[PDB]
Structure formats: C-alpha cells, structure tokens
Scaffold this active site. Structure first.
Site, PDB file in Angstrom:
ATOM      1  N   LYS A  24       9.667   0.620   2.102  1.00 14.48           N
ATOM      2  CA  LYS A  24       9.262   0.904   3.414  1.00 14.48           C
ATOM      3  C   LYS A  24      10.455   1.074   4.240  1.00 14.48           C
ATOM      4  O   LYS A  24      10.519   2.064   5.320  1.00 14.48           O
ATOM      5  CB  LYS A  24       8.138   0.191   3.919  1.00 14.48           C
ATOM      6  CG  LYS A  24       6.943   0.295   3.077  1.00 14.48           C
ATOM      7  CD  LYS A  24       5.635  -0.198   4.004  1.00 14.48           C
ATOM      8  CE  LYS A  24       4.579  -1.222   2.989  1.00 14.48           C
ATOM      9  NZ  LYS A  24       4.490  -2.544   3.451  1.00 14.48           N
ATOM     10  N   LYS A  71       4.858   5.905  -9.366  1.00 13.66           N
ATOM     11  CA  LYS A  71       3.620   5.716  -9.277  1.00 13.66           C
ATOM     12  C   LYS A  71       3.147   6.646  -8.159  1.00 13.66           C
ATOM     13  O   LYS A  71       3.684   7.250  -7.453  1.00 13.66           O
ATOM     14  CB  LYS A  71       3.471   4.203  -8.416  1.00 13.66           C
ATOM     15  CG  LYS A  71       2.642   3.883  -7.124  1.00 13.66           C
ATOM     16  CD  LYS A  71       2.919   2.508  -6.473  1.00 13.66           C
ATOM     17  CE  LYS A  71       2.512   2.796  -4.789  1.00 13.66           C
ATOM     18  NZ  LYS A  71       1.135   3.328  -4.677  1.00 13.66           N
ATOM     19  N   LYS A 117       0.281   7.807  -1.622  1.00 10.63           N
ATOM     20  CA  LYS A 117      -0.466   8.390  -0.609  1.00 10.63           C
ATOM     21  C   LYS A 117       0.872   9.292   0.357  1.00 10.63           C
ATOM     22  O   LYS A 117       0.534  10.375   0.852  1.00 10.63           O
ATOM     23  CB  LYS A 117      -1.117   7.580   0.612  1.00 10.63           C
ATOM     24  CG  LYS A 117      -1.995   6.783   0.106  1.00 10.63           C
ATOM     25  CD  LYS A 117      -2.869   6.016   1.190  1.00 10.63           C
ATOM     26  CE  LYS A 117      -2.254   4.923   1.706  1.00 10.63           C
ATOM     27  NZ  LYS A 117      -2.939   4.074   2.836  1.00 10.63           N
TER      28      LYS A 117
HETATM   29  N1  TYM Z   1      -0.997   4.164  -7.661  1.00 14.19           N
HETATM   30  C1  TYM Z   1      -1.790   3.108  -7.260  1.00 14.19           C
HETATM   31  N2  TYM Z   1      -2.531   2.736  -8.465  1.00 14.19           N
HETATM   32  C2  TYM Z   1      -3.381   1.591  -8.349  1.00 14.19           C
HETATM   33  N3  TYM Z   1      -3.649   1.238  -7.289  1.00 14.19           N
HETATM   34  C3  TYM Z   1      -2.932   1.584  -6.170  1.00 14.19           C
HETATM   35  C4  TYM Z   1      -2.263   2.567  -6.377  1.00 14.19           C
HETATM   36  N4  TYM Z   1      -1.595   2.825  -4.885  1.00 14.19           N
HETATM   37  C5  TYM Z   1      -2.436   1.760  -4.426  1.00 14.19           C
HETATM   38  N5  TYM Z   1      -2.999   1.042  -5.066  1.00 14.19           N
HETATM   39  C6  TYM Z   1      -3.977  -0.153  -4.510  1.00 14.19           C
HETATM   40  O1  TYM Z   1      -4.723   0.517  -3.430  1.00 14.19           O
HETATM   41  C7  TYM Z   1      -5.070  -0.733  -2.545  1.00 14.19           C
HETATM   42  C8  TYM Z   1      -4.865  -0.246  -1.054  1.00 14.19           C
HETATM   43  O2  TYM Z   1      -3.604   0.282  -0.795  1.00 14.19           O
HETATM   44  P1  TYM Z   1      -3.040   0.227   0.602  1.00 14.19           P
HETATM   45  O3  TYM Z   1      -1.537   0.996   0.598  1.00 14.19           O
HETATM   46  O4  TYM Z   1      -4.121   0.553   1.675  1.00 14.19           O
HETATM   47  O5  TYM Z   1      -2.912  -1.293   0.782  1.00 14.19           O
HETATM   48  C9  TYM Z   1      -2.398  -2.292   1.219  1.00 14.19           C
HETATM   49  O6  TYM Z   1      -1.320  -1.658   2.307  1.00 14.19           O
HETATM   50  C10 TYM Z   1      -2.432  -3.578   1.440  1.00 14.19           C
HETATM   51  N6  TYM Z   1      -1.436  -4.443   1.628  1.00 14.19           N
HETATM   52  C11 TYM Z   1      -3.727  -3.898   2.369  1.00 14.19           C
HETATM   53  C12 TYM Z   1      -3.950  -5.463   2.430  1.00 14.19           C
HETATM   54  C13 TYM Z   1      -3.768  -6.007   3.752  1.00 14.19           C
HETATM   55  N7  TYM Z   1      -4.141  -7.224   3.717  1.00 14.19           N
HETATM   56  C14 TYM Z   1      -4.940  -7.619   2.380  1.00 14.19           C
HETATM   57  C15 TYM Z   1      -5.236  -8.640   2.067  1.00 14.19           C
HETATM   58  C16 TYM Z   1      -5.942  -8.569   0.571  1.00 14.19           C
HETATM   59  C17 TYM Z   1      -5.715  -7.370   0.000  1.00 14.19           C
HETATM   60  C18 TYM Z   1      -4.974  -6.271   0.431  1.00 14.19           C
HETATM   61  C19 TYM Z   1      -4.822  -6.358   1.759  1.00 14.19           C
HETATM   62  C20 TYM Z   1      -4.213  -1.891  -2.690  1.00 14.19           C
HETATM   63  O7  TYM Z   1      -4.943  -2.678  -3.451  1.00 14.19           O
HETATM   64  C21 TYM Z   1      -3.206  -1.150  -3.686  1.00 14.19           C
HETATM   65  O8  TYM Z   1      -2.376  -2.018  -4.856  1.00 14.19           O
END
Ligand code: TYM
Ligand code: A1EHN
Lengths: 326, 334
Positions: free
Chosen positions: B112, B194, B197
């Site tokens: 990031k 990967k 978004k």
């Molecule tokens: N290409 C992919 N293949 C498989 N899984 C994927 C892929 N891209 C994204 N993910 C998963 O989607 C979830 C949400 O992503 P975020 O970017 O919103 O995910 C995030 O930004 C987290 N930090 C949000 C968060 C904040 N606090 C937490 C506490 C517990 C669990 C999660 C969180 C995630 O599980 C991510 O691994």
C-alpha cells in the site's frame, strides 16, 4: 472566551517549579479562559509499568491538581480514557498524518522495544487538543514540535473538509517565577530529572526539603546578592524564596544584609516547606475522599464528552462515515 | 455459548469474486455452526483517501452485499466498525503492546506504500493494530479471511499472547480460517497476480456488482497455459489460469475440484471458460437481484446497523472493561 487544553501525565511527579510557575499561573486564570485539564492515562501506557501503580498515580495526579487550585466548577478536569472520543479521533487523525511526520519526531527519537504507542502518541496528542476546539495550549520546549503537528493536521484536515477544527496556538507568556535545579542552577528545575536531588517534589516533608536545600550549590567574602553569572546558585535561592514569599529581590538582599549562606538556605527551606505544608494538607483531604474524586471524575468527563462528541460527530460527517443510528 | 467467528471487509472500491471466495462464502457457511460477527470496517477504509460521499454510499453498498450473499442479521451480528467506539479504544491500547518492527515488516503496508506514495499515512502503518483490536474485542475463536490477511491475523495472535502473558486470560488467541481453494483468487489476464479491487486493468477483475454480460466477456478471455495437448487439470503452480478458473467454478457450483476435473476430461479450455462464464453469470445475476432489494430499503439497512452495533457493543464493552482493569486505568464512574 478561549478554550485552553493541558494534558497532565499521571506518572509526572510535580515540583515546586511546576507549582510556582505554570500551575500557579493557570490557577489564577480560570475565569479568564475555559481551562481543560486531561489526565492522559492513555499516553502513560506507552511506557510499560505496573497496573496498580498507574491506577494510583491517576488518582494522585487528580488530587494533586485539585490541591493546587484547579477548581472543577470553573475548569473541566477529567481522565483521558473516560472519554472514548480521544481514541476515536486519534485513529481518524492517523489517516491524515504522514508516516514520515511521525518518524521525524525527535521525542520519538528502534525495532525491538519501540512499541507503536510511543511512535503514534503525537497523533493521540493532536486528537486530545482538536476534540475541544482548543485555542491555546501551554506547551514546554519539548512539546513545541507536537503542537506544530497538531496545527499541521488541523489545517490539512480543514483544507479538505472546512472549518471542522480550530487551529490551536501556543500560549506564549511565561509564568515569571524562576526555579532552577538545586545542584545545576544553569538548568531549570524539571519534574523529569533522573537526579532527584535536583528538585523539590510537592509532597516532600520538611526534613527532606532541608536536606536538598542544604546541598544546594553556592560560591565563595560571601554575600547574598543576585547575580545569575557569579552567584547563580545563590541567585536561584533568592528566586525560589521570592517566588514563595512575594518579597522583591532588592528587598531580600537587604534582609540578608550581613547574613551568611546557611541562613539563606534555612530561610528558603522554611518558606518552601511552609508552602508545601498547606498544599499537602489539601492533597490528603482530596486524596482520601474517594466519593469526592469519583464525583469530580464523573462530572468532568461528562463536561468533556459534550464538547468532544460534537466535534467527533462533525469529523465523522465530513469524512463520510454513515452516522450511528440514534 | 458457541465459539465466536469475527471477520471484516472494507467499504472501499467494489467487492470482487476474490472477496467472495476468500471470505464471504465462508462467512455465510459458518452462520449456524458458530456465533458469527461480521463488520464493515470503515475506519480501515479511510487509511486510503476516499471521497466522503462515496465512502458513505459504499458503506451501505457493502452491507446490502453482505445481505445479498446470505449473511442473515437474525443469525449473525452485522455492524459498522465506527459505530462501536470500543474498536478505536482497544486499537489505541494495543499499540502499546505492538512493536514498531512488526508493523514495518508488513507486506500490506509495503504494498500500500508503493500504491499510494502520496498518502503513506500512520493509519496505513497502524492498520494491523486496529485489526487486532477488531478481532480481540469479541473473544474471537475463528477469523475467516483470504490468504492475504494471514500475516495480519498472525500479529493479532502474537499481540493476544503477549498481553495475556502479562495480565491473564483476557483475550482468546484466535485462529485463521483460510480456504483450501479460492484463498488467493488470481487475476484473469495475469494469473500470477492476485485479483485486486484496486487494479487499473479492470479486465483482471470480476466485480460482484458488475454487469454479468461484462463478466462473461472477461472470463472468456482469461489466459490459460500452453500445454500440448490442452488439459483441464488442477495445478496451481504450472497451470495457474486453468486452476484459477476451476477454483471459481467450484465456488459457484459447490462441486469439488476432482469432480470438476472428471467433468472436463476430453474438454478444452474454450469449453472450460464458457462453463465458468455461464456459472459465474448466473450467480451474479441472482446475487444482484437480492442486492437491489436490500440496497433500496435504506430504512432496513439502518435497522440492521442499529441492532448490530448494539449487539456488538455489549460484547466489545465487556472485553474493553477487562483490558482497562488489567492495564491499570481508573474505571469510568457509572
Ligand atoms: N483475491 C482474493 N482472493 C481471496 N480472498 C480475497 C482476495 N482479495 C481479498 N480477499 C479477502 O477478502 C476479505 C476482504 O478484503 P478487504 O480488502 O476488504 O479486507 C481487509 O481490508 C481486511 N483487513 C478487513 C478487516 C479489518 N479488520 C478485520 C478483522 C478481521 C478480519 C478482517 C478484517 C479479506 O478476508 C481478504 O483476504
Ligand atoms: C503528554 C502531554 C501531557 C499531553 C498529552 N496530550 C496533550 C495535549 C496538550 C498538551 C499536552 C498533552 S503536554 C504533553 C507533555 O509532554 O507534557
């Protein structure tokens, strides 16, 4: 009428320098300004320490500030952790603070015991100030950079969203009372000195005050006369005495006409301990009245919450959070 | 009481099929087996600068997308992170039990940093600590996330154990729940990267709210290997594109990878991508119909937020009270 915010470290062991300088100054201006005192227990835990010691030092700090004349009917006094908005605005302001800005902080000046609380506490300090629409912050020398970050964050945030925050200004005028370290009268008496024979803490008993005054540095015939160059130690003792008594330095010189340095230290200790005796008496009254301290803490935190929630609501609206349903 | 599940997603950008296969699918599947708590982490979103109007609209989008995927508010707690002040409070306190090195080693902070070099902010740096705070507030046993959150999840176990060893059994040590298949859904035109978004090459990405007709076009152009002869076999290393499509097909149909390998014996890549497109088109078409019914009832979204944040707060405040007691804070008077 301007808002003034000060943070009080629960671990800070206050001295007669703090009391006769800044604290006396601010105790006399509580009707001139809207003064806010925040005992910063969230900042304290950036240094690992015993939990029960921290609980007690929070209550000691509160009673000590009340002993000194902070009046909770005039001023807002509260404990930082009792107002969640500080942590909330602390996190939000992180997102508007450059990582480089924090790493260029000298007070943060590793990767083995720097916890992130030590690294990030300037942002929390910024949040503390901005929550209350603060106009003036009395900052010492080593807090100037932190105050500048607060103004930088506030103007940065305001430039994106409008006048959400007031830009705080330093409180420029100094107390006037001159209190220097007992063994180093070139340095100012400082609560954070690791050499404690340099300072007179507020709760010290008269026998202890005699010991530290008795070992205060001096010079050669001998004469009681104000000279910050030749007789700095003797000048400091006249400054402390005048600070306690209100007598002028020329008046004190004529008092010690033909008297020696031992009588000066004796007069200094007598006056300092006299002052510290009424202070301590008030401190123990407040400190043993748990119902009273609970009442102050409850009142102050509610006063503080009214202002902080207004601000945080404006911050959240501007940022674009969905407002919490009411 | 059942074991507790907690997980979060950002209301930033548009959720992809990677978000579905890595997290949301498992969230839905766990709602009966465990006590599930799902969060829209808007405080985490603002670590990347957002237009304020978009952030508020994206928050309601994410909630409706949770509901459209089958997250059931009568089964799960659903809430917005900023509506529960305890997340920020514990976030601050756990900064003091996190070392600076642990955060500067973080792959997400490095990536990031390079992506948003004009806004390398301290929230971006401190991101894992608030994440740990989100997890540890609810006495969480399991965290269903994709592979890219695994380092973050390991820090929160380390912060949990570090704190507990000082103070007692204050936090549960959480465990990752990362799927065997679909944990790192790959890019369509670049299957060694990967699916993200934030990709500027939008042909790499399947959005959950994207027009199915455009998703079909993108899937039919997914790159595949140059094996001679072509074989639909699951092999993530040497057959990245093909395996990614099998992963995506299995997440839409519920069939195992080997049941899909047999289904495609004697079949070539064109037929494979056509089936994936057909199955992904149908799933998104039905998801988007549910999405619009939830999304357009903002008074229902508001009620979900209100009930969820109240349910979250009862748990979070119980943990936070215990943390404050342990570290030495004077408790706020009642
Ligand atoms: N290409 C992919 N293949 C498989 N899984 C994927 C892929 N891209 C994204 N993910 C998963 O989607 C979830 C949400 O992503 P975020 O970017 O919103 O995910 C995030 O930004 C987290 N930090 C949000 C968060 C904040 N606090 C937490 C506490 C517990 C669990 C999660 C969180 C995630 O599980 C991510 O691994
Ligand atoms: C740590 C400290 C007590 C603090 C926290 N939050 C503040 C807001 C305004 C002024 C201050 C503070 S002074 C500062 C100091 O180093 O003495």
């Amino acid at each position: 009428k301007p808002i003034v915010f000060s943070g009080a470290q629960p671990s800070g062991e206050l001295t007669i320098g703090n009391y006769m300088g800044a604290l006396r100054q601010w105790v006399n201006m509580q009707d001139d300004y809207h003064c806010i005192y925040c005992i910063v227990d969230q900042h304290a835990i950036t240094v690992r320490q015993d939990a029960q010691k921290l609980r007690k030092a929070t209550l000691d700090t509160l009673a000590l500030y009340l002993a000194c004349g902070i009046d909770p009917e005039k001023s807002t006094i509260f404990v930082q952790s009792h107002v969640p908005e500080h942590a909330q605005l602390g996190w939000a302001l992180n997102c508007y603070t450059y990582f480089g800005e924090l790493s260029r902080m000298t007070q943060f000046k590793y990767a083995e015991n720097i916890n992130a609380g030590l690294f990030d506490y300037p942002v929390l300090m910024a949040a503390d100030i901005l929550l209350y629409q603060t106009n003036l912050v009395p900052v010492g020398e080593d807090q100037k950079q932190h105050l500048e970050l607060s103004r930088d964050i506030a103007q940065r945030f305001n430039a994106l969203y409008g006048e959400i925050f007031k830009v705080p200004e330093p409180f420029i005028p100094k107390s006037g009372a001159r209190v220097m370290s007992l063994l180093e009268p070139t340095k100012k008496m400082s609560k954070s000195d690791d050499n404690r024979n340099n300072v007179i803490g507020l709760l010290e008993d008269p026998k202890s005050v005699v010991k530290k005054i008795k070992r205060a540095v001096t010079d050669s015939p001998p004469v009681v006369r104000y000279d910050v160059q030749n007789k700095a130690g003797v000048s400091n003792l006249l400054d402390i005495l005048s600070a306690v008594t209100g007598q002028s330095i020329p008046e004190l010189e004529k008092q010690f006409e033909g008297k020696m340095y031992g009588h000066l230290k004796g007069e200094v200790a007598d006056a300092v301990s006299g002052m510290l005796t009424e202070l301590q008496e008030r401190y123990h009254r407040f400190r043993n009245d748990e119902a009273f301290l609970q009442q102050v803490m409850k009142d102050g935190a509610e006063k503080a919450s009214a202002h902080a929630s207004r601000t945080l609501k404006a911050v959240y609206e501007a940022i674009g959070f969905v407002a919490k349903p009411h």
